[PDB]
Design a protein around this ligand. Structure first.
Ligand SMILES: [Zn+2]
Ligand SMILES: [Zn+2]
Lengths: 833, 60, 114
RNA sequence: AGAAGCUAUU
RNA sequence: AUUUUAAUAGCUUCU
């Protein structure tokens, strides 16, 4: 048989697929133990199938599903049955395994108890447990004094972690007497603590976890302890009422008037957090406290009506207005003159390789809520925690060249002060008012306040007019001003440092002009032995991002404060971020809803957090590719030792092996070179190693997204390139070509001709067609379209010429020459500046 | 011909919006679906028929 | 002068929000907590005196708001008004199968606690 | 060759 | 009622 095994010998190590072509006294010493019959597939088979999912090869998964009446065979006859987005029903199908999984967990504990009462020491593996929960192999177990046995179960539980949330294993815990036929437990409305239930669940299922668990993460030791305890809390928060989460409120007295304020917060991940700077009776309200109380969602909800919205599956809180709101989107404006000129110049002939794809799409009054109901793809996810710890160390090794820390209110740089401040401030003015009316002392005091308390904020949902080749309204999430000010003071130093560095893995801030594209491509090519190019996109970035990876991103970003913030200060900062941009109240057309998680795009650190997320997923794919290969098959001694030490540092070494972290970082930099911007990535990798399996391919990335990001990756959004002279197929919506400039050869980025043509043809405001003082618009479009003159296809190369003749038309109507000369635009891609 | 149909659909939808049709929910929703299907369509026959329907909506 | 103007704006908004707050039920629900701290989500559930329901289609309506009084969240609600997506009053007797196409969905129901 | 203000484009 | 970050062009003031 060719089955999944979890192995650690002196020679080989890993979770992979292998061929399978004293114990009496041990068995005599040891209801969770088999006699009898043994389910063809073990728990290792299921774990490997769900963790290494590949379409067109999931025969074992199909057999496991149709064996246990999770679905029928005809369920697999329909296409995209395995897709999370196109076929949500698969989730329900997966849940049909849940209870069985849960049963296995309980039996494991029994087994371990037996060992602790017989003085037996041994390492638990998933492949010794049948799908019914029966342990049936005691090979290496030795004897010790009875009553002092010890089981090692870190690999078992760590590998099993994702499947617990994938199959919804703890559903039966939400019923009376933990019985699926029994009714649901009727928790009190006022209960919010749940600490003792968390401890009871931990002792029921994870009794033999060696590490210490903190139900409230405010008691943790560092950021790694925060990650570990937050993972456990993510698993345990799925069995508690959804009304028990969010801000905890209280009644205070200001000048004897009773106000309702927020004094704490109950997180799903971080447990219960209480504000320290609380005064039950207050005298007068200055600017700072008035701001904090007005941004508070507590009173807004407390003074609103009960709301029941059946259009959405998001938890609803209240309706501020008495009538629901409807925001539509209008069609674009048509530039008749440009259309006439293009038609006269011989364009738009039927069959031309250049066709108008990008338009402006109108929407009806139910567009904002229709786009808001995309967080339904955000599912609670439990992560392999040993893998997450090693990967977070490797991922921070990518950020060890930047400068960061805390700045003051006189060191803060804000680009645009005419932007909006969010609810409830949007009612009284722009961000200029709130930056101008606060002195630097007030802002410093507000920062000092956020370092010991939690201020919950409300975001707004806005519809953005845009151009696309897809029929979809787009919503952006605007954040309140207070969150932005303290995030700026907390993060701007590091963000500016990242944006002011050249030749690095993250290329945010690097211009594409004046040879920038050539420099970036040459930096990413590095000196990889057998280079191939790979690229990918994330299907739904902000909607379908697990909350654990967002917390990891925030912790990696905040690690720069080693000398300026104590650990309580850093934890309260992280709690503020989680309560402000992760799971907060969302105002969507006059009503308040609860955000499941993911990402708010109007955040101050969105692109950099996305870059951390990209590096984490890539490193995870590399680890899962290296660890799942037959060690005997590998022919290089260095790579085999690297794999063995990677397994040991993952599941056998609680402390951090810094030297091996450096070694793995060097291996990745040599053989897997990345250029990354937000969720966009281009990789130059060693072909021979990827073919042998020593580095990740695109299928490893697809499997990682399948079991971690809750999305499916279609080949229609992934690209591979073999010839390096042709650059990346796509990167930030640009194609690449190797033109001849002077006596050198240089890479040039060019856009899609349809996009530039549509941008010229369609606008969003009527005056954009009437002012005729928009020559700069066409000049910018021509600066973008200039590289197309080097394309072999003539219809492509003719778009820039058409733009030049239209600019001439406009200038001759108004009336320099440079704007119709090709030298002005040729100088925009020359290295010398 | 296709591009002329799409551009004329854009112009006609803009005119209808100028005619305060956006304040009738069913009319505007039907117009939005018709316009989007025109924009994503490929054959000019049904696109012409949809243009005719939108023009009849405008004249009504 | 703006600082003073936005200070007054915040003060007013706070006190007006206060003036709409049904304080007796809030006192009743707060005084039962272990230390006077309650979750925010349950305050409109157990204190609000008006309910708004948004209904996309007829199946959801007949499974949610059948008649003139319905039970939701362990309370009884008397239907006060029904309005269409165009914000025009819809009579209760019109919400049948035959008149479903004429109505402009989704429907907004306003109910009062009873 | 620089800073600051405004608009536009990707 | 219209968010975050980056790059670029044009116009004005000014050592
Ligand atoms: Zn801890
Ligand atoms: Zn700091």
């Amino acid at each position: 048989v060719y089955r999944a095994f979890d192995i650690y010998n002196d020679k080989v190590a890993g979770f992979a697929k292998f061929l399978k072509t004293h114990e009496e006294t041990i068995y005599n010493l040891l209801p969770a133990v088999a006699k009898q019959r043994l389910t063809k597939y073990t728990m290792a088979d299921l774990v490997y199938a769900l963790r290494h999912f590949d379409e067109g090869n999931c025969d074992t998964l199909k057999e496991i599903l149709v064996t246990y009446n999770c679905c029928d065979d005809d369920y697999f006859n329909k296409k995209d049955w395995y897709d999370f987005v196109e076929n949500p029903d698969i989730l329900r199908v997966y849940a049909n395994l849940g209870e069985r999984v849960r049963q296995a967990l309980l039996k494991t504990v029994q087994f371990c108890d037996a060992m602790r009462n017989a003085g037996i020491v041994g390492v638990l593996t998933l492949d010794n447990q049948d799908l019914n929960g029966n342990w049936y192999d005691f090979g290496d177990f030795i004897q010790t004094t009875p009553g002092s046995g010890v089981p090692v179960v870190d690999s078992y539980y760590s590998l099993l972690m994702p499947i617990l949330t994938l199959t919804r294993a703890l559903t039966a815990e939400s019923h009376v007497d933990t019985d699926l036929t029994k009714p649901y437990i009727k928790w009190d409305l006022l209960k919010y603590d749940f600490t003792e239930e968390r401890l009871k669940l931990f002792d029921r299922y994870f009794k033999y976890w060696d590490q210490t668990y903190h139900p409230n993460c405010v008691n943790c030791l560092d950021d790694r302890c925060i990650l570990h305890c937050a993972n456990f809390n993510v698993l345990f928060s799925t069995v508690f009422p959804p009304t028990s989460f969010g801000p905890l409120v209280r009644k205070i007295f200001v000048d004897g008037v009773p106000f309702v304020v927020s004094t704490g917060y109950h997180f799903r991940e971080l447990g219960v957090v209480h504000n320290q700077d609380v005064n039950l009776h207050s005298s007068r309200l200055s600017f700072k406290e008035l701001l904090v109380y007005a941004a508070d969602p507590a009173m807004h909800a407390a003074s609103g009506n009960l709301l029941l919205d059946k259009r959405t599956t998001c938890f609803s809180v209240a309706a501020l207005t008495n009538n629901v709101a409807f925001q539509t989107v209008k069609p674009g404006n048509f530039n008749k003159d440009f259309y006439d000129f293009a038609v006269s110049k011989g364009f738009f002939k039927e069959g031309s390789s250049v066709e108008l794809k990008h338009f402006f799409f109108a929407q009806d009054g139910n567009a904002a809520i229709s786009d808001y109901d995309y967080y339904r793809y955000n599912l609670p996810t439990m992560c392999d925690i040993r893998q997450l710890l090693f990967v977070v160390e490797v991922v921070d090794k990518y950020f060890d060249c930047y400068d960061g820390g805390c700045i003051n209110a006189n060191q803060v740089i804000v680009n645009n002060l005419d932007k909006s401040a969010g609810f409830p401030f949007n009612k009284w003015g722009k961000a200029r008012l709130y930056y101008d009316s606060m002195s630097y002392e007030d802002q410093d005091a507000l920062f000092a306040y956020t370092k010991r308390n939690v201020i919950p904020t409300i975001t707004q949902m806005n519809l953005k007019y845009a151009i696309s080749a897809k029929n979809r309204a787009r919503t952006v999430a605007g954040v309140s001003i207070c969150s932005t000010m303290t995030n700026r003071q907390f993060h701007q130093k590091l963000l500016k440092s990242i944006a002011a560095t050249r030749g690095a893995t993250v290329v945010i801030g690097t211009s594409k002009f004046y040879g920038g594209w050539h420099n970036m491509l040459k930096t990413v090519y590095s000196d990889v032995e057998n280079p191939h190019l790979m690229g990918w996109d994330y299907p739904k970035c902000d909607r379908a991002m697990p909350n654990m990876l967002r917390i990891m991103a925030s912790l990696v970003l905040a690690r720069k404060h080693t000398t300026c913030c104590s650990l309580s200060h850093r934890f309260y900062r992280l709690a503020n971020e989680c309560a402000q941009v992760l799971s907060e109240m969302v105002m969507c057309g006059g009503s308040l809803y609860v955000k499941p998680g993911g990402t708010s795009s109007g955040d101050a650190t969105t692109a950099y957090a996305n870059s951390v997320f990209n590096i984490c997923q890539a490193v995870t794919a590399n680890v899962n590719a290296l660890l799942s290969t037959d060690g005997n098959k590998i022919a290089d001694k260095y790579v085999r030792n690297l794999q063995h030490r990677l397994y040991e540092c993952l599941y056998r070494n609680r402390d951090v092996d810094t030297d091996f972290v450096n070694e793995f970082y060097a291996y990745l930099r040599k053989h897997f070179s990345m250029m990354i911007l937000s969720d966009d990535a281009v990789v130059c990798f060693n072909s021979t190693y990827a073919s042998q399996g020593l580095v990740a391919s695109i299928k490893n990335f697809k499997s990682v997204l399948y079991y971690q990001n809750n999305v499916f990756m279609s080949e229609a959004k992934c690209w591979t390139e073999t010839d390096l002279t042709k650059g990346p197929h796509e990167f930030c919506s640009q194609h690449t070509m190797l033109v001849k400039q002077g006596d050198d050869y240089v890479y040039l980025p060019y856009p899609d001709p349809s996009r530039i043509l549509g941008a010229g043809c369609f606008v969003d405001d009527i005056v954009k067609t009437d002012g005729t003082l928009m020559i700069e618009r066409f000049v910018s479009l021509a600066i973008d379209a200039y590289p197309l003159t080097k394309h072999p296809n003539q219809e492509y190369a003719d778009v820039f010429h058409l733009y030049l003749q239209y600019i001439r038309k406009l200038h001759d109507e108004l009336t320099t020459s440079r704007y119709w000369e090709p030298e002005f635009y040729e100088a925009m891609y020359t290295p010398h500046t | 011909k296709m591009s002329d149909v799409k551009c004329t659909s854009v112009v006609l939808l803009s005119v209808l919006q100028q005619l305060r049709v956006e304040s009738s929910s069913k009319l505007w929703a039907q117009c939005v679906q018709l316009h989007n299907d025109i924009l994503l369509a490929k054959d000019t026959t049904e696109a012409f028929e949809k243009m005719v329907s939108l023009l009849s909506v405008l004249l009504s | 002068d703006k600082r003073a103007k936005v200070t007054s704006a915040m003060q007013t908004m706070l006190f007006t929000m206060l003036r709409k707050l049904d304080n007796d039920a809030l006192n009743n629900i707060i005084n039962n907590a272990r230390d006077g701290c309650v979750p925010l989500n349950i305050i409109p559930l157990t204190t609000a005196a008006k309910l708004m329901v948004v209904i996309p289609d007829y199946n959801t309506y007949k499974n949610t708001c059948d008649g003139t009084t319905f039970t939701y969240a362990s309370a009884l609600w008397e239907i006060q008004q029904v309005v269409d997506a165009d914000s025009k009053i819809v009579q209760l007797s019109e919400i049948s199968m035959d008149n479903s196409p004429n109505l402009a969905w989704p429907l907004i129901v306003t109910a009062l606690r009873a």
